[PDB]
Design a protein around this ligand. Structure first.
Ligand SMILES: CCCCCCCC/C=C\CCCCCCCC(=O)OC[C@H](COP(=O)(O)OCC[N+](C)(C)C)OC(=O)CCCCCCC/C=C/CCCCCCCC
Ligand SMILES: CCCCCCCC/C=C\CCCCCCCC(=O)OC[C@H](COP(=O)(O)OCC[N+](C)(C)C)OC(=O)CCCCCCC/C=C\CCCCCCCC
Ligand SMILES: CCCCCCCC/C=C\CCCCCCCC(=O)OC[C@H](COP(=O)(O)OCC[N+](C)(C)C)OC(=O)CCCCCCC/C=C\CCCCCCCC
Ligand SMILES: [Zn+2]
Ligand SMILES: [Zn+2]
Lengths: 528, 48, 146, 48, 49
């Protein structure tokens, strides 16, 4: 939860605005409350061998990574899923360790034309324990990947569904997304969401069970009470006849009852959301590659890419590269275009110099066609230390010597020196930009209060005034705890102040949050 | 009370009631109200 | 003191005491603090480079083995990618240090059925390993200064 | 340098009013005071 | 040299000291060619800023 708070603060300060600050804060509090509910639910009541060099190096790398009867079945299943949810992250780390072990073992393959034009890939180990170890490790890795998918599905998917339902409910009640307006037909999210509206269980994770009514009454006069009822799959005839007279039949508890009680449309909508979730897709790809690893062991190397996702330090280092990823890609495109222009010039004028053959009887002209010349340039000149001139023929003693030396020098300066300098500069500037963002977050949080926005000096008029204000008076944790307490408390038990805040929260009016004002300023002269 | 009564007209004309502040001839800050046309506002919102 | 004593057993152990300049000279201490400010990130970057080169080694071992003959005597071939350990050592030791990557040292792809797959292999090696990861190292140092 | 120029532009536009030059704190004495001032009171679009 | 001393002195393959030597060459390349030169470029780049 502390990491989530830190990420939220970073987002609000850097990319977030100021008019929506309290909206984002309340959304974060709601997400945190749901996460705590999930947590409560799951909580239980000399000569050196190449191999010798290899074994020592592997220990060093791992250290870097480490440093950085139906009733009985139901109870057993719930225990199992709770265990997986509790140990999800541990299972991910275990999968990473298994991947490293599998790849270390992979480092001992050998290929031969004879058994231990087809070829034999066999493991060459003196101990002989590695091959059984490889088999068991591969099986265990696949099992752990499956368990990781289940743990994700039981621990983090609920939050995804909660957020989707919450957003859709807010759009329905305060934007009339499917009443006053319509999705833009490119908004695949809304187009897909058009499926859960009529579903009997639209708010299954979101705690607001009154959404359908709220929306009906608010937009009912303009669109009638029958169009909204049709859209939301709610029966007014039921809403009235139920109150008038109704029955409680109890279906015989059983798998048949469970089968009839399945909201296929919701379930179908739920699966679309999950299979569109990025992390779930990553885990599914992990599982697929782990399965393919039993078809060919070398597919297990793909799981070494999991270090970027796992290790935090590596994630930050790679975020440095991806911060300007679009600019890097466009720079590579610009390099391609420039090399194409150089290829055009070389093809038109300097063709005699592109003979990469030593046998005079068999010339090998690399610039007698534009495709070949462009491939030669992009593949060889770019990688050459001094450009194309390092590889194509010497210009000395030729009528085009000066034109050619200008050609080569310009290639070297524009391609080798400048464009590559642009790439290095993009990365180096990404580092500094990220550092500046972090510093800005720290400075804001130490200079002004998050809630009211008053500066630190005014509070510091009193000894440790700002510290006291940010720890006791205007505390984000206290505000979130108040939202939790108010949600759990019954409306009938709400007090006057609690009722007022509850009404404003229901109406999404964030004017109860102090803004540019505080208790000390309000009662300054009496308090003094 | 009058503003509550006239809320409808005020809401309808909200996007067209332009308002600025100047240092007027009275040597005090004065507030000037004028009309903004729909064509002008659309042209302003044009992305260019 | 221990190295100074060992220097009487072998005089060349006295070279270890030249490392004392880092501790002694203040300017050098600051210059080296620039490097050690992001030491953890530098080490993790080297680890990432090792992993990426391992992936390239896997691909080369599985597909491009005919090109890793580093012998001129046709009677005595020297295949540097007929086993994974040898291929990984070859990559990490030679391709990383090469100016243009592994393609500078392993065989020419021209006139082969896998020519385009191989040119993509070499260009990606050059860009990811030689250009970007080293750019990350330089960037870590340059940002430490700032 | 280009990044710093962009950041300076953003900081100026979020700290002081373009027209009068008064700081954001004085306006923020009132809830969303600076936002209201820059959207209704001293608005570049309204002046144009 | 572009890749350090290993580019110019003899090949270590097939020798009892091969691993000690590859470590020698890689460390030379990283410390001298990559880092110290990176320090020089960084000093200039930071002077600009
Ligand atoms: C930024 C910092 C600057 C770095 C400075 C230079 C980096 C050098 C790097 C890497 C290690 C390369 C391999 C070192 C040599 C080991 C060779 C070996 O394995 O041969 C074991 C010998 C066999 O005995 P012999 O009969 O041949 O005796 C020889 C008698 N003679 C010498 C008088 C003829 O046993 C012995 O004598 C060994 C007894 C003495 C033990 C130390 C000798 C080597 C010290 C190397 C530096 C320490 C590790 C560097 C860490 C990496 C850099 C961070
Ligand atoms: C969201 C993130 C996405 C990241 C994507 C990267 C995933 C890696 C890529 C591609 C997988 C595509 C799968 C399609 C192939 C279908 C399977 C197939 O038809 O396979 C055939 C051959 C196997 O041959 P066999 O029958 O003789 O096996 C012996 C088995 N018996 C004896 C039973 C016959 O397959 C072979 O060649 C096996 C050799 C495989 C070695 C390369 C595997 C990749 C490993 C490391 C590099 C990772 C690349 C990273 C690029 C993206 C970076 C972001
Ligand atoms: C807190 C900071 C830690 C920094 C650690 C770096 C310290 C340097 C490293 C290692 C010392 C390990 C000592 C173990 C060896 C025990 C002594 C031994 O058994 O020695 C045997 C051979 C000597 O042979 P001999 O019998 O024929 O002598 C002739 C003598 N008679 C004629 C009487 C027989 O030892 C030889 O090879 C002598 C050749 C030695 C030349 C290399 C010495 C290192 C010098 C420069 C590189 C520094 C490396 C920096 C790496 C870390 C950077 C931070
Ligand atoms: Zn406050
Ligand atoms: Zn103003």
């Amino acid at each position: 939860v502390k990491e989530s708070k830190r990420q939220f603060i970073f987002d609000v300060v850097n990319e977030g605005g100021e008019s929506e600050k309290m909206e984002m804060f309340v959304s974060f509090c709601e997400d945190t409350i749901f996460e705590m509910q999930i947590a409560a639910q799951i909580s239980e009541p000399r000569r050196l061998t190449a191999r010798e060099a290899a074994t020592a190096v592997a220990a060093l790398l791992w250290a870097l990574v480490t440093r950085a009867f139906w009733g009985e079945l139901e109870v057993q299943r719930v225990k199992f899923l709770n265990y997986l949810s509790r140990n999800f992250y541990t299972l991910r780390f275990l999968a990473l360790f298994l991947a490293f072990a599998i790849n270390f073992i992979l480092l001992f393959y050998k290929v031969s034309d004879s058994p231990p034009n087809m070829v034999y890939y066999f493991l060459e180990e003196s101990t002989g324990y590695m091959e059984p170890a490889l088999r068991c490790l591969s099986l265990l890795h696949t099992l752990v990947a499956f368990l990781c998918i289940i743990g994700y599905n039981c621990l983090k998917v609920p939050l995804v569904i909660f957020k989707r339902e919450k957003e859709l409910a807010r759009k329905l009640e305060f934007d009339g997304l499917y009443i006053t307006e319509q999705p833009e037909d490119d908004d695949v999210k809304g187009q897909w969401d058009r499926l859960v509206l009529n579903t009997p269980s639209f708010p299954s994770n979101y705690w607001d069970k009154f959404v359908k009514r709220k929306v009906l009454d608010k937009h009912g006069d303009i669109f009638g009470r029958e169009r909204i009822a049709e859209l939301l799959g709610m029966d007014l005839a039921s809403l009235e006849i139920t109150a008038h007279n109704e029955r409680k039949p109890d279906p015989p508890p059983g798998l048949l009852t469970w089968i009839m009680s399945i909201d296929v449309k919701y379930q179908i909508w739920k699966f679309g959301v999950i299979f569109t979730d990025n992390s779930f897709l990553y885990l599914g790809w992990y599982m697929v590659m782990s399965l393919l690893g039993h078809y060919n062991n070398f597919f297990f190397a793909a799981h070494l890419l999991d270090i970027a996702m796992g290790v935090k330090t590596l994630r930050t280092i790679l975020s440095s590269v991806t911060h300007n990823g679009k600019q890097l890609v466009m720079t590579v495109g610009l390099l391609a275009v420039v090399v194409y222009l150089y290829t055009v010039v070389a093809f038109n004028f300097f063709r005699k110099f592109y003979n990469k053959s030593e046998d005079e009887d068999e010339p090998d002209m690399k610039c007698d066609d534009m495709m070949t010349c462009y491939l030669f340039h992009m593949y060889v000149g770019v990688r050459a230390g001094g450009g194309i001139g390092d590889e194509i023929e010497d210009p000395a003693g030729d009528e085009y010597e000066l034109y050619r030396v200008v050609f080569d020098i310009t290639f070297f300066f524009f391609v080798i020196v400048i464009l590559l300098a642009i790439i290095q500069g993009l990365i180096i500037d990404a580092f500094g930009e990220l550092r500046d963002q972090q510093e800005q977050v720290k400075e804001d949080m130490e200079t002004k209060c998050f809630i009211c926005g008053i500066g630190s000096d005014y509070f510091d008029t009193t000894p440790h005034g700002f510290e006291t204000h940010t720890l006791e008076e205007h505390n984000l944790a206290n505000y979130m705890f108040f939202l939790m307490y108010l949600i759990n408390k019954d409306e009938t038990e709400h007090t006057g102040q609690e009722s007022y805040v509850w009404k404003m929260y229901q109406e999404r009016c964030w004017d109860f949050f102090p803004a540019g004002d505080c208790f000390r300023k309000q009662y300054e002269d009496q308090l003094s | 009370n009058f503003l509550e009564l006239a809320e409808s007209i005020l809401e309808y004309f909200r996007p067209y009631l332009g308002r600025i502040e100047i240092m007027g001839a009275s040597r005090r800050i004065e507030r000037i109200y004028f009309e903004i046309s729909e064509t002008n506002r659309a042209q302003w919102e044009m992305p260019q």
